[PDB]
Nucleic acid binder design. Structure first.
Lengths: 50, 75, 64, 116, 136
RNA sequence: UCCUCCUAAAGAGUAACGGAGGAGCACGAAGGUUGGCUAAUCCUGGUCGGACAUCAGGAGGUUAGUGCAAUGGCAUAAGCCAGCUUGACUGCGAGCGUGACGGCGCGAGCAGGUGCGAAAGCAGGUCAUAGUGAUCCGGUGGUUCUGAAUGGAAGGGCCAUC
């Protein structure tokens, strides 16, 4: 199980975050998906983090 | 070196032709699509066929490939 | 002597109006990344104790 | 084969409209005389049809089978459908790319009352 | 010693020998040996019967074998308890139903044919009879 | 422990130290949508090139392929290619399947806010079926919900997650 788990933190001030997995060996750059934040009820950019 | 098996998945037809069903009830549980969704019948992600409307379920053969279809008529 | 309530049971079941019991679902503690949101969402609300194990619950907490 | 490729292309759309159960505006395009038809959900009867093959509509446009012809047919189907009563329809490409004459016919139809 | 090549599976279920024979008519030669009883023939028995006829006819005519073993049979080693998995394959047998034609032959007189088949049947575990090719 | 076939006796289920094989993943794309495309194997001609590279034509109609063993399915393609994208979204959920239970599975539809398309529409991960571990204890972020004289705080609770 080389694939490891990461946390996607909303660009907004809200503390809401998503959790997923990625492979650092093949795709080491950050992940910048655009997801829905229910605290602010808007779609915002989510940044990868621990 | 044998002796392994998997728990049975209890597939098969749950509702047979000519009996009324409620909307959302499972009609057929299948791995592939042995029966294809017809009228007022929806297909799930696992190829499960469920009723999208209330009525009587019937089976029929249609298409150039004589593939089996399940439909529901509001009766 | 009076019966002793099973303290562990009293922390997991709450009695309701019609004599039933509500409990928290038992699969929403950890290892949550690999779980679909649909399954986690359905486990959030409290659920009623099944009939088969209701008799066991009655014995554990005869006072509550 | 051109026909076999076209039928294969449009089969998915036709099936989707068929199961949806809605009146569909089907257009057939050729090097001349672009056709158009309105089909009931059952697919057994034609509510109304128009084209540039009949003298009633072919006596004005200089040449049949161009952008102007598509607009005329697209417009022609409009008032006929509005007069009949049906308002909402589903457009069917019939395997024809929605780029030129097909687009012109649809654009004329939608602006003429047959919104879809 | 007839035996298949690269069979799909090493072992197969015992099954049953119910039913009735299919190849009940002479199709290649003019004379044949029909099976009256029911049972199974091993590869060794088929080879023994074949050798008996070839010697009897003195390599004159043609011989057809209408049965193939295509069925492994296992046998537990001596002093082995029950269980611990299926036994190892030992020999191959052919299931025979009544009316099955075992061997066919052609190119020899009827008189010489009868004795040749009689010698072969003497080395088989099933009742057999002599038959002749029928017209349609 | 889990998955596929047979045993299993044409609904479901069904044992053996019975007969065969696999899994403890992978993928920000291999996901969503829109548009387009249709194999294996053979025959003939053609430099290296040769039975087997690539090109052209013909028979063939899926014996191909489908990320991974098997079964079922797949031309409307679920198979192959490209553009734009994050619905691999949040709160729910009529009604069903499956289990002794814990639980597991399918799901129309409603609200909010998104992607693709002119549009009807599709999207709550992947052709489906394995890729998984209860509770306790404790860690991290949010939330005056609580906070044992009062105002705070510590510690608990709830939510997300390890």
């Amino acid at each position: 199980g080389i694939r490891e788990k990461i946390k996607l933190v909303s660009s907004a001030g809200t503390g809401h975050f998503y959790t997923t997995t990625k492979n650092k060996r093949t795709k080491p750059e950050k992940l910048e998906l655009k997801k829905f934040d229910p605290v602010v009820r808007q779609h915002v950019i989510y940044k990868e983090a621990k | 070196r044998n002796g392994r098996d998997s728990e049975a998945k209890r597939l098969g037809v749950k509702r047979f032709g000519g009996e009324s069903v409620l909307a959302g009830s499972i009609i057929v549980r299948q791995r592939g699509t042995k029966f294809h969704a017809g009228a007022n019948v929806g297909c799930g992600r696992d190829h499960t066929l469920f009723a999208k409307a209330d009525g009587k379920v019937k089976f029929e053969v249609k298409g150039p490939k004589n593939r089996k279809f399940i439909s529901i008529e509001a009766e | 002597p009076k019966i002793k309530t099973v303290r562990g049971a009293a922390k997991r079941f709450k009695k309701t109006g019609k004599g039933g019991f509500k409990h928290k679902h038992a699969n929403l503690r950890h290892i949550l990344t690999k779980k679909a949101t649909k399954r986690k969402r359905h486990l959030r609300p409290k659920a009623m104790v099944s009939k088969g194990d209701l008799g066991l619950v009655i014995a554990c907490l005869p006072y509550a | 084969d051109k026909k076999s490729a076209r039928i294969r292309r449009a089969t998915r759309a036709r099936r989707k409209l068929q199961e949806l159960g809605a009146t569909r505006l089907v257009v057939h395009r050729t090097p001349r005389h672009i056709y158009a038809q309105v089909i009931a959900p059952n697919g057994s009867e034609v509510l109304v049809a128009a084209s540039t093959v009949e003298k009633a509509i072919a006596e004005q446009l200089k040449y049949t089978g161009n952008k102007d012809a598509a607009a005329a047919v697209g417009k022609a189907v409009a008032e006929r459908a509005l007069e009949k009563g049906i308002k909402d329809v589903s457009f069917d490409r019939s395997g024809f790319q929605y780029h030129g004459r097909v687009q012109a016919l649809a654009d004329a139809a939608r602006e003429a009352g047959l919104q879809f | 010693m007839l035996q298949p090549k690269r069979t799909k599976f090493r072992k197969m279920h015992k099954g049953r020998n119910r039913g009735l024979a299919q190849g009940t008519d002479v199709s290649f030669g003019s004379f044949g040996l029909k099976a009256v009883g029911r049972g199974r023939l091993t590869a060794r028995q088929i080879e023994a019967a074949r050798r008996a006829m070839t010697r009897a006819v003195k390599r004159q005519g043609k011989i057809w074998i209408r049965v193939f073993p295509d069925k492994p049979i296992t046998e537990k080693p001596l002093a082995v308890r029950m269980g611990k998995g299926k036994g190892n394959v030992e020999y191959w047998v052919a299931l025979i139903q009544p009316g099955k034609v075992l061997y066919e032959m052609d190119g020899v007189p009827e008189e010489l044919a009868r004795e040749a088949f009689k010698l072969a049947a003497a080395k088989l575990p099933i009742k057999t009879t002599f038959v002749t090719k029928t017209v349609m």
